[PDB]
Amino acid sequence: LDELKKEVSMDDHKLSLDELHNKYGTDLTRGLTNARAKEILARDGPNSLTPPPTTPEWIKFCRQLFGGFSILLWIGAILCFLAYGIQAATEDEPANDNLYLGVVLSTVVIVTGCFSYYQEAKSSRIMDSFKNMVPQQALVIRDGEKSTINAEFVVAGDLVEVKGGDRIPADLRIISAHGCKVDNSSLTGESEPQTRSPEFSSENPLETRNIAFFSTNCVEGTARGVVVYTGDRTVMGRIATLASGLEVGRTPIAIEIEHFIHIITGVAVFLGVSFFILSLILGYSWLEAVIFLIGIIVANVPEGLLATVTVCLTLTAKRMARKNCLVKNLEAVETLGSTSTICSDKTGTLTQNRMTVAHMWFDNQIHEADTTENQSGAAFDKTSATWSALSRIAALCNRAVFQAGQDNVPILKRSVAGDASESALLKCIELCCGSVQGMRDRNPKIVEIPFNSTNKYQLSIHENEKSSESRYLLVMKGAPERILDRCSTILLNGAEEPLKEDMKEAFQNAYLELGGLGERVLGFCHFALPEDKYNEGYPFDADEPNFPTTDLCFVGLMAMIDPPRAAVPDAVGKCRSAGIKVIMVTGDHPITAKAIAKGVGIISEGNETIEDIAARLNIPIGQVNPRDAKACVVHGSDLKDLSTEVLDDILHYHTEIVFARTSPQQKLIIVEGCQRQGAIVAVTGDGVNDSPALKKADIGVAMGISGSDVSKQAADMILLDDNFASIVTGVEEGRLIFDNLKKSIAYTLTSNIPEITPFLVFIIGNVPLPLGTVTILCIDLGTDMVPAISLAYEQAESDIMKRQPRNPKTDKLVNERLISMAYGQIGMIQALGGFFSYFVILAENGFLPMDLIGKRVRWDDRWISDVEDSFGQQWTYEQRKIVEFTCHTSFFISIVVVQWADLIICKTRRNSIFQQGMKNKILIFGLFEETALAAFLSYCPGTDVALRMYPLKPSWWFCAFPYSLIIFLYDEMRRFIIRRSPGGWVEQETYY
């Protein structure tokens, strides 16, 4: 469906103005007829974007109500009402058991539904942001007259007019223009104004001057044009549809959840029906056969687990909110940890998005300035008298000014009225020479010649601030070579000197080096005009050369670039040390893209492209073995004629990849290419041209300050302070939460065994029921909750940023090793500790373990109010039941006591508690509150009716203590083996 939109567009900028009118039945001068425009409206439809059909929240909520655990809990809830129905008909049961348990279980499903619904959130308003880029109104020429109309009423063929400050209402063929410049950052991510004129200037319509696009704005001048595309058919309207239309897809974390749901659901249905038939064979009435099944359901399903996961995710997202990293989708909290490839935009993401002075060439020396936002570098020069001469030209031969009321904000961050290069120079001098306004007050400008297309230079004449002179100084800047052809002397370390071929060659060298760094280079020179030849009232003519512009003194060079953000180089290296592959994907030109790649460490030192090898060896590129080149730089124009299989080979064959001059669909294609190889991919960006890629990414991260509204709609995560170091933190947090989820899951599952085994022995042994159904829910929904959550606050056991990204095909959240430990080893020890306390309670009340076998028949018989114990005493029905429920209560408390040790062992997968310590305060809180809850549930009056919880005698609490301790020792010995031999036996069997 969207495969059409993933392709490069076709256009009609090649046609003549006249020819273009024939195609759209239009007038170049009079414009369309009121009737013809209305006709075309009904024909083509409105100049608007329609949002894609969404899934209502209704269906979204209910889709969770049927996912493995909820299905089993539904079967339980209904099976409760089943047994209740069968009762209400047969023998009038005045009880509330099956009825209430059926109500409780149905509530558990609904509430669990809210948790998973909260986790599976999708806040997407892509198409809405795009719609915000179409103006409310447009100016059209109809019947030879200009009028404002609803922009939706704009059709292909009419004559539109735009001017500085307004949004392009539709894709236009420029037919007339006067000084028109446009901001195409929507399509390129670059905000430098692009001229628009009627002349065709490139085969590529996205590069030609005679096309203006919807989603962009006119920055200055005026233009008229013929509408060629409207609504969904515009270049960026299609990007809108592509972006808004892209299928979301399941996250890595989501896939893991479903996976263990299958496992646990599997064992549940297995043991469920495996013992349902095992009971009927033993001659159990279907009346009972279902009651046992309900218990089996409740025992096997970890009722509180899915909600635990959600809370652990939420708490991890809260910590990241506190580092200026907003998470829109709870699952995106983990994806960053599983990320193996980052596709990053350059401008406004890796870079500050601001022309900044990078180097200066004066005194036959290359000086480097500090490009960082917060200025974390050092000085270059202050002493040289040459510097002050260059500094003066940079301030004086400059027409840029700071906007009013910025004195509060830092120099480099403040808004400037002017072109990017003049702003850069302004901020450079203001920083290291103080107020520039002061320099422009001490040296009043009397005449100037602003930068001309033809002159290729800008000159200014000022009253020298010096009192002993107060004469006229000439300054000029422009193209380095043009400035050179106008110089005779060079200000070396203070004093001038003739411009010999020697210094002239050093100039060329300096010029070539700076240009090689992808930096824009300017020349600077001045000339102190002779006093006798220029009186204090001498008039200077700016129109006609009234003053010399030759034999001037060359002062120096200055170079500039849109520099990396301070934290970016280090963040890139850190991603790469964690084994994450970092690719650059930018709409910017290749020379600039490549230079920043080396600056931030995308391309490491020494690595070459095929073009680099060819130039170094002075040989044809076809003569170069492409396998000798680990780095590559792909232009979008070449990308366009490559198949995906060939794109896949590029991705496979290079470690250091730069995709430059890419369109928005091309970014999507590169992302998909990476994913196709089985990689989890993150995208980082800030422009509307990142929207499709951000949507398709497993996780999209947008910049918060510099980011466009669209990009932040398309993302899963926002960096609110533009701190790229947050990606590094995000991946670290993502890995940590993945491990801690394992700990929390194992902990929760472990207590399933002591809830399952009592029901089994109840059938096979014919003893009184050791633990009840209600009692199970008091564990999974009550006591285990805070402890399970607390594992989310566990510190790393080792340097997680030192390991490679997990293999999502092999490294699962819940594997066989977890089940073996939780179900086969620790849970089994917990089961016994439960049974022990059960036998203790009964034996101390007169029913010794031996006489318990095959007694349930008489025990449950409501009409036998005289059962004989081991000592020959006789018990009524309600009397023995009180002891039985007291058994449920102590078995319950036994679970809590054995979960103490389990909580401590689940703390660490490898390390010892004596190494990791007990610095998790939430965990300790869990221990205290868990025990408080259990005690309250046993001793609070009335709980014997609502939950069948009975007061325990002090000695009862200590039954499971020896089992709780064996768990601690056992797991500590086991992990001691793991560490002592990384070999594999204990490791490959039990290492979560």
């Binding site: 300790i924 408080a932 005690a935 007061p951 325990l952």
Partner: protein
């Protein structure tokens, strides 16, 4: 005692409940103290 051994079939479940609830409360307070050591 002999025929007056009524205490043999008696248990102070009332005190046990009072003590049990005291303990539960104090464990609840202790927990808050440790948690609130930083919020």
């Amino acid at each position: 005692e002999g025929p007056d051994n009524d205490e043999r079939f008696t248990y102070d479940y009332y005190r046990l409940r009072v003590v049990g609830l005291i303990v539960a409360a104090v464990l609840c307070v202790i927990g808050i103290i440790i948690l609130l050591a930083g919020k």
